[PDB]
Scaffold this active site. Structure first.
Site, PDB file in Angstrom:
ATOM      1  N   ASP A  10      52.342  49.604  44.886  1.00 30.16           N
ATOM      2  CA  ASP A  10      53.418  50.123  45.711  1.00 30.16           C
ATOM      3  C   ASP A  10      53.114  49.847  47.183  1.00 30.16           C
ATOM      4  O   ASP A  10      52.099  49.242  47.533  1.00 30.16           O
ATOM      5  CB  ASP A  10      53.599  51.620  45.455  1.00 30.16           C
ATOM      6  CG  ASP A  10      54.992  52.112  45.796  1.00 30.16           C
ATOM      7  OD1 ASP A  10      55.253  52.384  46.985  1.00 30.16           O
ATOM      8  OD2 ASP A  10      55.824  52.230  44.872  1.00 30.16           O
TER       9      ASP A  10
HETATM   10  C1  LIG Z   1      48.196  67.238  59.220  1.00 32.39           C
HETATM   11  C2  LIG Z   1      49.668  66.919  59.493  1.00 32.39           C
HETATM   12  C3  LIG Z   1      50.679  67.589  58.535  1.00 32.39           C
HETATM   13  C4  LIG Z   1      51.277  66.656  57.445  1.00 32.39           C
HETATM   14  C5  LIG Z   1      52.830  66.476  57.465  1.00 32.39           C
HETATM   15  C6  LIG Z   1      53.419  65.473  56.421  1.00 32.39           C
HETATM   16  C7  LIG Z   1      54.842  65.802  55.862  1.00 32.39           C
HETATM   17  C8  LIG Z   1      55.350  64.939  54.657  1.00 32.39           C
HETATM   18  C9  LIG Z   1      56.455  65.587  53.752  1.00 32.39           C
HETATM   19  C10 LIG Z   1      57.660  64.669  53.368  1.00 32.39           C
HETATM   20  C11 LIG Z   1      57.396  63.573  52.307  1.00 32.39           C
HETATM   21  C12 LIG Z   1      58.252  62.305  52.439  1.00 32.39           C
HETATM   22  O1  LIG Z   1      57.814  61.219  52.163  1.00 32.39           O
HETATM   23  S1  LIG Z   1      59.997  62.461  53.033  1.00 32.39           S
HETATM   24  C13 LIG Z   1      61.211  61.562  51.913  1.00 32.39           C
HETATM   25  C14 LIG Z   1      61.911  60.366  52.601  1.00 32.39           C
HETATM   26  N1  LIG Z   1      62.733  59.528  51.709  1.00 32.39           N
HETATM   27  C15 LIG Z   1      62.249  58.706  50.682  1.00 32.39           C
HETATM   28  O2  LIG Z   1      61.036  58.648  50.484  1.00 32.39           O
HETATM   29  C16 LIG Z   1      63.248  57.905  49.854  1.00 32.39           C
HETATM   30  C17 LIG Z   1      62.982  56.383  49.719  1.00 32.39           C
HETATM   31  N2  LIG Z   1      61.594  56.007  50.012  1.00 32.39           N
HETATM   32  C18 LIG Z   1      61.243  54.698  50.402  1.00 32.39           C
HETATM   33  O3  LIG Z   1      62.168  53.897  50.482  1.00 32.39           O
HETATM   34  C19 LIG Z   1      59.770  54.298  50.714  1.00 32.39           C
HETATM   35  O4  LIG Z   1      59.873  52.938  50.985  1.00 32.39           O
HETATM   36  C20 LIG Z   1      58.795  54.478  49.516  1.00 32.39           C
HETATM   37  C21 LIG Z   1      59.529  54.285  48.194  1.00 32.39           C
HETATM   38  C22 LIG Z   1      58.210  55.877  49.599  1.00 32.39           C
HETATM   39  C23 LIG Z   1      57.601  53.398  49.570  1.00 32.39           C
HETATM   40  O5  LIG Z   1      58.065  52.195  49.260  1.00 32.39           O
HETATM   41  P1  LIG Z   1      56.992  50.700  49.281  1.00 32.39           P
HETATM   42  O6  LIG Z   1      55.628  51.303  49.530  1.00 32.39           O
HETATM   43  O7  LIG Z   1      57.258  50.182  47.892  1.00 32.39           O
HETATM   44  O8  LIG Z   1      57.598  49.922  50.423  1.00 32.39           O
END
Ligand SMILES: CCCCCCCCCCCC(=O)SCCNC(=O)CCNC(=O)[C@H](O)C(C)(C)COP(=O)(O)O
Ligand SMILES: CCCCCCCCCCCCCCCCCC(=O)OC[C@H](COP(=O)([O-])OCC(O)COP(=O)([O-])OC[C@@H](COC(=O)CCCCCCCCCCCCCCCCC)OC(=O)CCCCCCCCCCCCCCCCC)OC(=O)CCCCCCCCCCCCCCCCC
Ligand SMILES: CCCCCCCCCCCCCCCCC[C@@H](O)O[C@H](CO[C@H](O)CCCCCCCCCCCCCCC)COP(=O)(O)OCC[N+](C)(C)C
Ligand SMILES: CCCCCCCCCCCCCCCCC[C@@H](O)O[C@H](CO[C@H](O)CCCCCCCCCCCCCCC)COP(=O)(O)OCC[N+](C)(C)C
Ligand SMILES: CCCCCCCC/C=C\CCCCCCCC(=O)O[C@H](COC(=O)CCCCCCC/C=C/CCCCCCCC)COP(=O)(O)OCCN
Lengths: 459, 63, 124, 70, 84, 104, 128, 219, 178, 175, 88, 55
Positions: K43
């Site tokens: 990924d």
């Molecule tokens: C110490 C500090 C505190 C920590 C704070 C952190 C907070 C995080 C909480 C939120 C989690 C989230 O991801 S927020 C959710 C945001 N939306 C999505 O994840 C939908 C689609 N995702 C994608 O398209 C990406 O590319 C993906 C498939 C992931 C990769 O793909 P590759 O790799 O194939 O490129």
């Protein structure tokens, strides 16, 4: 005193009957010899003066200024050598002629036993400087600058002439010795108030006083290197010398007539110093630093105490040397970059290390690092001001702080950091520029060994 | 050998000039070198005069 | 600390003021009032030029300590007896000061109990 | 000035017995000095002169009369 | 003369999670259904001479044994010499 | 200019400026050697409140400590020769009012 | 839910906390495209003039010249006397002068009165 | 004013040091706190004792910085204590020297820092001072002990955290000799100077048992 | 640095960048390696719960509350690599980087030393002189009309060609020149 | 050393203690002083003898300049410029001499403070009083004259002081 | 400093060493030219974790704009060599 | 006479000799740092003597 006046006049036929390729060598050598001869004037007495004749006399206030005036010409020739290379022999000889005339006028000005002769030569120094600014100036604003440098000065000095002749109608003499010995107090009257103002504002405009300083950044920025050196080093000190000479008749009016100006200076040294913090031009920054230092000198003269006068004399000499050296460094940068902008050419320490050392020493003296004579003058003026009033220190203190800031700012913006990438015509420094900086800086660190030679008659 | 020459041209020569300068020129002028007077305690004898400073008042010694 | 806790929380006039000691006559306790004796005279105690705050009633032991420290210089551990004696004299001076503190404290106690007793008798 | 010591890449670095014995000797002399000073001069930490109890003094020496004389 | 003798890397089969806190990490993850893909990378921090740790008091007491021995020897010598 | 991109391939990497772009009127005030306006982990008002509170509390408590000093249960120190009169100030021709110290 | 971050003048809002970038619209993308287009045109010109083996001087930058000219020489022709400018000039150019005049005059009057009364203790004050 | 300034300085700088991650910043805040302690000493009218503290602090703080620099050079220009791990055995001379320096800094009895800081605390306890200044001096002593603990723990006790390519090396005669000279200094100079100088203040001969030892309890 | 920036960041790039920032700041918070590994795996698990999510509006609603949470818990003193734009040695050696053209100003006595180097330097100068005349026309022909739309440069397509505007990339002073 | 007058710069007899070694341990200070003497003072002394004999081979004198007295400003006509010049020069020389007198007293005070060690607050009271007197005199004579000081201004200041003194004394006498 | 002059062989060996310690990738299938997303079935989050591991193992952090387009171990080796000015 | 003054000024004076030599040839070689360190050590051992005189 004719042993100094006559050779400086003989510098003219020697220049005009020289070879097309030997004018600079001949002028430099004979100017240095004249400086060595004028070294004789430094010996002074604890008593009145060295009265040579009815026309010219010397004092320990006139002696350091005369020595600096004679010493400055060879440096001006060395720095003017470069940018006048493409000039026809007649015009180079005309430039040297203007410099020689200016030196002669200053030499005769600083002796000047009588006040009208002093005024005549004081205003005669206006013509060669104006021609130098408005003829051999790079920018289009030089003409405008020239007008400023003219009219301001004349606006201040035309009333003075009236006052002067008026005095001779009442006292009968303008000879400095009789004026000293036959002095009488001035009553508190409107006529006396205006005579005081007419006597003072003429020298106030050339220091220059804050609010009357507008001509100075223009004249310093638009003048060639020799013009800038002679303006910052000597032509600013004419007002201080004139105030030291003429205030002997203005008592006790100065005891309260100094209030409008002291403030304008005490606050002014702040404002101008602050202006130096936000400046995109090197020459304007150096000009405003000169304004601040001369504002402190104005304060010292207006306080009118022995420590005030010693500090003012020492600061005048030290500031002349330091400002001349700073202008020379800025010009060496300008001759390479053709820009006159601080932020454009950067990181020059890595490319030109010895010039960076020269910059560091010049800024350290400008910063008033002890035991340089700059700090001797500043400290004497600060002690005198504190005795005058205990609150002045606050203002003085702030100025000191601000000064350091912009000084090192000027050192850090141009010398430290990363070099500008697209500038590739930064050739190594010539022997001429290095010798110029050495000849500026070594007299300062030598004069710090024998301070009494620059502390004036009240030592 | 290096440290022998070092102590001669870097310690011995400078201390000669400093000592010559101090003991013939600086001390030629009055009040240039002023020494804090040495402490005098009971029972001490002075070289110049030869007299003896008297002892104390025989305080009662206990513990 | 306890005296701070008492004075700053209890009755301010109940406990003495260090800036104003003493507030009672020296003879108010008992009439004998034997005086303190100072051993070193002015001349020698000036010739040793100790310090203006070291010029207290313990000065003679300090003189002895300085005499040894100058005498047995290279062995800087030769004399501990004089250091011990000077420390003992300073301890005695401190306990005399503590005695003076507590004396004025309990004298003020007795005085206060007095004027309150006469107040009670007058009100009766 | 010293000897050649090579990198290791994820194992313990090479140590000379010289630095080991030197560090041990200096730590040992530190602890020996602390113990020697504590034994020979213990009054610097625990004190030497006792602190008197102010309430344990009697009114005879403190200039107190039984609330009736003066 | 520098450190040029072609040092070799260890073999990557040497690093086993076995015997570390990384078992605890893997078990606490698997209790929720998770795995650490880089757990084996850091095993060198617990494998060789880094396998033994020293406590704060132990670090402070670095040379207490030899110092105490020398101290008691000196006290014995001083006692036997003073009482003569 | 401190908060500009540090990884961009600027023409002037130290200034973090590009040739030909318009220059901020107050550039020489934001030159990474002077005031920077970068966002902070904490809000500006919160830092101001905390810092102001910390300073005011310290000054107030120092005043309180001045009002309520700390000392030991002792009387004033005693000095032998009339509170050491002769060698503190001098003036030997006045015969000052004597004070004698109480032995307890 | 968490406590919110409050931007100020000297502590600006982070890019990640800007709601404007999340209102993605076609004209926003087109604006960013033309922005980077002009940036890339300028960069191309600068690199063409920078990598040239024949150029042996400084690359004259119009932006720096405009900045310096606007900061120094373009002020007065655009100056217009307004109540804002008039009041600010009067304040910042007169008020400090009269304030310091009042302060120093008061101090020196007090000192002179003390001298005339003779209760100042200027002993040892030889140098002035 | 001097006493109040010194007290607030030492407290605030120790409180800032308690949680720093740069080793050089930690030691800098340590020396700022020690300077505040010197100013407090000045404020209670004890100048020669402040000079003596200056002299001791010279030795042990210079050696602390040299040990910090040795570690920094050893781990390829690294300063953040999150990336120094187990160095108790990896580099032993730096470890023992910095241990001795942290012990002297905290006034472990019969070291160079004892003969100055212990007297500082005894003098500040029994002087007519601000209650607040004394309180913050005590808290500053505690925080000094605490940030010394932080340095030791985060840089020498745990498991290593530096990059895999180990370049740790101590065997240079220059570094070893320079460190060992100040090691001998910070051990014995306190005693030597304290016993050679003439007495320059009245001693604090008698103390409450709890007041005499208060520095040790706080540390 | 090496890559020319694009017109904007897609949602993928923003999410990946936030993930890396969160991992770095969590590593800063969790000093020890085992604790960091545990919490990093837990963060990864909390991060891919919405990996397969479909519509853009609610995904953009996410990564926003996540950014607020990150800004709340961002460890105001994070770990920075020594050479990074905030590190303790970020620009330490920038004072030792001298341009190559400075070498042209050397005195002949200085160039008498190091003669083979200056022969190679002359070869490099000649190569640049010819390659520039080729590169200018290559860029003129390859450039879309109306100016470049990105600051990305095309490679060399012929036999003797060199990449356009190559002189000031290959002749970087060094990473640690002294 | 006869290089300066002992009456102008007084110094106490300089009584010093004698060594009373209480231990048989040889000190390093005496050995260090002995080797310092042998290695430094002897070569310096021989060099000085050589230089002194070279100087004695060529002995020549220089003299101090004497200045006659002239009428001062009080006995000079209002507009007679020659007598004003002479009186002014005399007054300036007297001002310089007064400055040097204050310098001498200040040097005495500084030397006393350094010499007396810790008992300076007592043993320098005579020097402090003498400096107070000289400072009062100098301040009355020359203070507040200004940068453009002269004999006429000093005379006017003295005259105003004398008028004030006479008026105050007359008022006190008739009260 | 006293740091050895690392070479391309060292960089390649170290990169492959770190990749083999990644249990998500079997060691026999990976090669220097083995792509990450397609040949190794990874990924994007696994790619950013690999980049972070490279950063922590080499001591310098790669800008994200350059990190997101590193897809082969050979490309990572080439990027690190270009950054650190490695000859052979 | 009285070596105290001579030595306590000599230490400060010899502290400045390498600054005088900073324009010599030794400054352009690698022996300068050792020269400065040796000078400082010699100055320290010379300064130890007036300390003994004071003690
Ligand atoms: C110490 C500090 C505190 C920590 C704070 C952190 C907070 C995080 C909480 C939120 C989690 C989230 O991801 S927020 C959710 C945001 N939306 C999505 O994840 C939908 C689609 N995702 C994608 O398209 C990406 O590319 C993906 C498939 C992931 C990769 O793909 P590759 O790799 O194939 O490129
Ligand atoms: C040496 C050290 C340095 C010294 C030098 C530097 C510092 C000292 C010198 C420099 C400062 C000197 C400034 C002097 C003031 C110059 C005013 C001027 O030239 O105006 C011409 C200028 C030209 O007139 P205009 O173009 O026909 O009018 C257009 C206006 O925009 C139309 O505006 P409007 O008509 O709506 O407003 C005008 C009206 C309303 O005024 C106001 O807006 C507020 C009140 C301001 C003044 C009273 C408070 O006037 C008033 O009510 C107040 C009159 C007083 O008028 C102005 O812009 C200023 C009007 C008000 C100026 C008030 C200044 C008060 C300052 C204190 C004295
Ligand atoms: C970088 C490598 C350096 C290597 C060299 C190292 C050598 C060390 C020395 C470096 C400086 C140390 C200073 C030590 C002092 C020695 C010089 C000093 O003693 O002489 C001074 C004397 O020097 C002069 O006073 C100062 C020189 C004056 C400078 C005037 C410049 C002349 C031409 C310049 C043009 C003018 C432009 C400025 C206009 C005003 C003071 O002497 P003084 O004790 O008091 O009395 C003189 C002798 N008496 C007793 C017979 C009366
Ligand atoms: C702008 C940049 C700066 C340039 C230079 C500025 C400095 C010039 C300042 C001029 C000095 C002050 C002027 C007069 C000072 C004397 C004090 C007097 O004016 O104040 C009171 C006088 O009150 C009032 O001042 C009366 C005159 C009021 C009119 C003056 C104009 C005020 C504002 C004008 C500003 C213009 C200045 C700039 C011109 C371009 C004193 O009370 P009084 O006992 O009764 O008078 C004693 C004198 N006697 C005995 C002769 C009668
Ligand atoms: C760059 C700008 C600087 C300009 C400075 C110009 C201002 C100088 C001050 C006033 C100039 C003229 C003063 C008079 C010259 C001296 C003559 C004199 O001393 O005699 C006076 C002369 O008195 C006058 O003539 C005063 C008239 C003034 C008319 C012009 C006024 C100009 C404006 C003055 C106000 C501004 C003051 C500050 C200006 C600062 C500069 C900006 C007494 O008169 P008598 O006839 O002798 O009486 C004896 C019997 N009772």
């Amino acid at each position: 005193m004719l042993k100094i006046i006559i050779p400086t006049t003989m510098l003219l036929p020697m220049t005009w009957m020289s070879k097309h390729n030997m004018i600079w060598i001949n002028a430099t050598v004979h100017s240095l010899l004249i400086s060595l001869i004028s070294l004789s004037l430094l010996n002074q007495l604890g008593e009145n003066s060295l009265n040579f004749s009815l026309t010219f006399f010397s004092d320990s206030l006139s002696a350091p200024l005369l020595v600096l005036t004679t010493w400055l010409l060879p440096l001006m020739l060395m720095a003017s050598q470069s940018h006048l290379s493409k000039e026809t022999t007649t015009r180079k000889k005309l430039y040297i002629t203007m410099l020689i005339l200016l030196q002669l006028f200053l030499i005769m000005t600083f002796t000047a036993t009588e006040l009208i002769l002093f005024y005549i030569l004081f205003e005669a120094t206006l013509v060669p400087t104006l021609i130098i600014i408005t003829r051999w100036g790079n920018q289009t604003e030089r003409l405008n600058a020239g007008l400023y440098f003219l009219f301001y000065t004349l606006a201040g000095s035309l009333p003075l002439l009236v006052a002067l002749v008026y005095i001779q109608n009442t006292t009968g003499s303008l000879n400095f010795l009789i004026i000293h010995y036959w002095s009488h107090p001035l009553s508190n009257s409107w006529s006396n108030i205006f005579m005081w103002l007419a006597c003072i504002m003429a020298f106030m405009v050339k220091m220059p006083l804050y609010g009357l300083h507008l001509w100075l950044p223009k004249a310093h920025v638009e003048a060639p290197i020799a013009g800038s050196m002679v303006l910052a080093a000597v032509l600013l000190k004419l007002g201080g010398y004139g105030m030291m000479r003429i205030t002997t008749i203005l008592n006790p009016l100065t005891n309260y007539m100094a209030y409008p100006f002291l403030m304008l200076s005490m606050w002014g040294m702040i404002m101008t110093s602050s202006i130096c913090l936000r400046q995109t031009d090197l020459k304007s920054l150096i000009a405003y630093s000169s304004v601040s230092h001369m504002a402190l000198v104005i304060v010292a003269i207006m306080i009118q105490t022995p420590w005030s006068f010693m500090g003012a004399t020492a600061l005048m000499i030290a500031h002349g040397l330091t400002s001349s050296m700073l202008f020379c460094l800025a010009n060496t940068n300008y001759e390479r970059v053709h820009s006159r902008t601080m932020i454009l050419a950067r990181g020059l320490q890595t490319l030109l290390p010895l010039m960076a050392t020269w910059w560091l020493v010049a800024s350290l003296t400008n910063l008033a690092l002890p035991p340089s004579i700059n700090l001797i003058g500043e400290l004497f003026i600060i002690t005198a001001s504190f005795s005058w009033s205990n609150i002045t220190i606050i203002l003085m203190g702030m100025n000191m702080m601000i000064t350091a800031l912009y000084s090192l700012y000027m050192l850090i913006t141009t010398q430290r950091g990363k070099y500008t990438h697209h500038i590739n015509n930064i050739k190594p420094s010539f022997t001429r520029e290095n010798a110029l900086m050495a000849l500026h800086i070594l007299p300062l660190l030598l004069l710090t060994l024998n301070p009494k030679m620059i502390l004036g008659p009240l030592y | 050998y290096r440290h022998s020459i070092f102590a001669v041209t870097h310690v011995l020569i400078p201390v000669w000039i400093i000592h010559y300068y101090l003991k013939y020129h600086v001390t030629a002028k009055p009040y240039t070198v002023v020494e804090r007077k040495p402490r005098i305690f009971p029972g001490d004898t002075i070289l110049e005069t030869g007299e003896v400073i008297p002892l104390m008042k025989e305080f009662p010694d206990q513990h | 600390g306890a005296h701070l806790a008492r004075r700053y929380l209890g009755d301010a006039s109940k406990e003495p003021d260090p800036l104003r000691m003493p507030t009672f006559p020296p003879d108010y306790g008992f009439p004998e009032r034997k005086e303190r004796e100072m051993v070193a005279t002015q001349q020698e105690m000036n010739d040793a030029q100790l310090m203006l705050q070291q010029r207290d009633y313990c000065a003679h032991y300090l003189i002895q300590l300085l005499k040894c420290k100058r005498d047995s210089f290279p062995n800087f551990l030769a004399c501990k007896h004089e250091q011990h004696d000077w420390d003992y004299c300073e301890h005695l001076d401190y306990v005399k000061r503590m005695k003076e503190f507590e004396r004025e404290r309990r004298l003020l106690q007795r005085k206060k109990r007095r004027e309150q007793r006469e107040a009670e008798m007058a009100r009766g | 000035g010293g000897v050649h010591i090579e990198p290791r890449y994820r194992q313990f670095p090479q140590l000379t017995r010289s630095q080991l014995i030197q560090a041990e000797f200096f730590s040992a002399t530190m602890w020996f000095w602390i113990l020697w000073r504590f034994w020979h001069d213990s009054d610097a930490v625990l004190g030497h002169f006792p602190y008197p109890d102010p309430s344990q003094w009697t009114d005879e020496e403190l200039g107190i009369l039984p609330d009736d004389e003066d | 003369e520098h450190g040029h003798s072609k040092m070799e890397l260890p073999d990557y089969k040497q690093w086993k999670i076995e015997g570390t806190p990384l078992e605890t990490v893997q078990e606490k993850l698997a209790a929720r259904g998770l795995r650490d893909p880089w757990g084996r990378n850091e095993a060198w921090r617990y494998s060789g001479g880094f396998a033994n740790n020293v406590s704060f008091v132990g670090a402070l007491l670095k040379g207490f044994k030899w110092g105490f021995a020398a101290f008691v020897v000196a006290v014995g010598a001083e006692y036997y010499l003073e009482s003569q | 200019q401190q908060e500009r991109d540090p990884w961009y391939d600027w023409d002037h990497p130290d200034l973090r400026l590009n040739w030909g772009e318009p220059i901020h009127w107050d550039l020489d005030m934001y030159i990474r050697n002077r005031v920077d306006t970068s966002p902070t982990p904490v809000s500006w008002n919160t830092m101001c409140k905390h810092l102001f509170g910390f300073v005011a509390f310290m000054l107030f408590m120092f005043w309180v400590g001045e009002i309520y000093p700390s000392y030991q249960p002792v009387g004033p120190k005693q000095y032998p020769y009339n509170d050491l009169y002769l060698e503190r100030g001098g003036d030997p021709t006045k015969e000052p009012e004597p004070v004698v110290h109480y032995e307890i | 839910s968490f406590p919110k971050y409050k931007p100020s003048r000297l502590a600006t809002l982070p890019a990640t906390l800007d709601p404007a970038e999340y209102d993605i619209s076609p004209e926003t993308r087109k604006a960013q495209a033309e922005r980077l287009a002009i940036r890339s045109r300028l960069k191309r010109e600068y690199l063409l003039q920078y990598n040239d083996p024949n150029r042996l001087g400084v690359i004259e930058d119009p932006a720096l010249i405009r900045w310096t000219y606007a900061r120094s020489a373009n002020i007065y022709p655009n100056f217009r006397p307004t109540p804002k400018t008039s009041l600010l000039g009067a304040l910042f150019g007169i008020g400090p002068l009269f304030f310091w005049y009042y302060v120093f005059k008061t101090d020196r009057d007090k000192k002179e009165k003390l001298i005339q009364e003779g209760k100042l203790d200027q002993t040892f004050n030889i140098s002035y | 004013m001097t006493l109040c300034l010194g007290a607030i300085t030492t407290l605030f700088t120790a409180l800032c040091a308690i949680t720093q991650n740069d080793i050089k910043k930690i030691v800098a805040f340590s020396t700022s706190s020690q300077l505040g302690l010197m100013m407090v000493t000045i404020g209670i009218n004890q100048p020669h004792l402040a000079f003596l503290h200056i002299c001791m602090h010279a030795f042990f703080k210079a050696m602390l910085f040299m040990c910090s620099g040795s570690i920094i050079h050893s781990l390829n220009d690294e300063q953040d204590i999150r990336k120094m791990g187990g160095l108790y055995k990896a580099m032993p001379f730096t470890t023992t020297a910095l241990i001795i320096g942290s012990l002297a800094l905290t006034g472990m009895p019969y070291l160079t820092g004892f003969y100055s800081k212990d007297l500082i605390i005894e003098a500040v306890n029994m002087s007519y001072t601000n209650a607040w200044a004394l309180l913050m001096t005590l808290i500053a002593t505690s925080l000094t002990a605490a940030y010394s603990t932080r340095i030791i723990f985060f840089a020498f006790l745990g498991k290593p955290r530096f990059p895999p390519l180990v370049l740790i090396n101590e065997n240079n005669p220059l570094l070893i000799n320079s460190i060992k000279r100040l090691l001998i200094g910070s051990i014995f100079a306190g005693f030597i100077i304290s016993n050679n100088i003439p007495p320059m203040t009245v001693p604090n001969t008698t103390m409450p048992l709890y007041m005499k030892m208060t520095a040790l309890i706080v540390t | 640095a090496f890559s020319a920036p694009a017109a904007y960041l897609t949602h993928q790039q923003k999410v990946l960048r936030l993930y890396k920032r969160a991992l770095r700041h969590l590593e800063s918070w969790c000093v020890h390696r085992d604790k960091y590994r545990y919490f990093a795996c837990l963060m990864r698990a909390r991060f891919d719960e919405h990996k397969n999510e479909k519509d853009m509006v609610k995904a953009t609603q996410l990564l926003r509350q996540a950014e607020e949470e990150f800004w709340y818990g961002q460890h105001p003193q994070p770990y920075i690599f020594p050479e990074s734009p905030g590190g303790t040695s970020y620009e330490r050696y920038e004072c030792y980087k001298v341009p190559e053209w400075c070498l042209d100003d050397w005195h002949p006595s200085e160039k008498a030393m190091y003669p083979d180097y200056f022969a190679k330097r002359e070869q490099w100068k000649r190569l640049r002189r010819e390659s520039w005349e080729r590169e200018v026309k290559q860029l003129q022909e390859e450039t879309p009309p109306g100016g470049p739309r990105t600051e990305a440069l095309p490679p060399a397509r012929k036999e003797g060609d060199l990449p356009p505007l190559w002189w000031h990339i290959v002749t970087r002073p060094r990473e640690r020149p002294m | 050393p006869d290089s300066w007058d002992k009456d102008v710069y007084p110094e106490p007899p300089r009584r010093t203690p004698a060594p009373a070694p209480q231990t048989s341990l040889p000190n390093p200070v005496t050995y260090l002083t002995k080797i310092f003497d042998l290695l430094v003072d002897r070569p310096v002394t021989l060099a000085r003898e050589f230089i002194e004999q070279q100087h004695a081979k060529n002995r020549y004198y220089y003299y101090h300049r004497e200045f006659r007295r002239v009428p001062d400003i009080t006995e000079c006509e209002e507009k007679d410029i020659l007598c004003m010049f002479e009186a002014e020069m005399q007054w300036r020389r007297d001002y310089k001499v007064d400055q040097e007198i204050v310098n001498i007293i200040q040097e005495r005070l500084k030397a006393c403070q350094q010499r007396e060690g810790e008992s300076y607050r007592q043993n320098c009271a005579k020097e402090l009083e003498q400096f107070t007197q000289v400072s009062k005199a100098f301040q009355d004579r020359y203070s507040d004259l200004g940068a453009h000081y002269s004999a006429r201004k000093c005379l006017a200041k003295q005259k105003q002081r004398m008028l004030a003194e006479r008026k105050a004394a007359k008022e006190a006498a008739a009260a | 400093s006293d740091a050895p002059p690392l070479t391309l062989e060292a960089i390649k060996d170290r990169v492959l060493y770190v990749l083999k310690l990644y249990d998500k990738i079997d060691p026999e299938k990976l090669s220097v030219n083995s792509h990450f997303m397609k040949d190794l079935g990874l990924d994007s989050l696994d790619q950013v974790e690999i980049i972070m591991a490279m950063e922590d193992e080499f001591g310098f952090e790669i800008p994200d704009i350059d990190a997101e387009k590193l897809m082969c171990p050979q490309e990572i080796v080439d990027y690190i060599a270009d950054k650190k000015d490695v000859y052979e | 006479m009285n070596p105290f003054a001579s030595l306590t000024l000599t230490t400060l004076t010899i502290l400045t000799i390498p600054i005088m030599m900073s324009n010599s040839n030794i400054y352009k070689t690698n022996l300068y740092p050792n020269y400065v360190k040796t000078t400082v050590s010699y100055a320290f051992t010379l300064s130890l003597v007036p300390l003994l005189m004071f003690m």
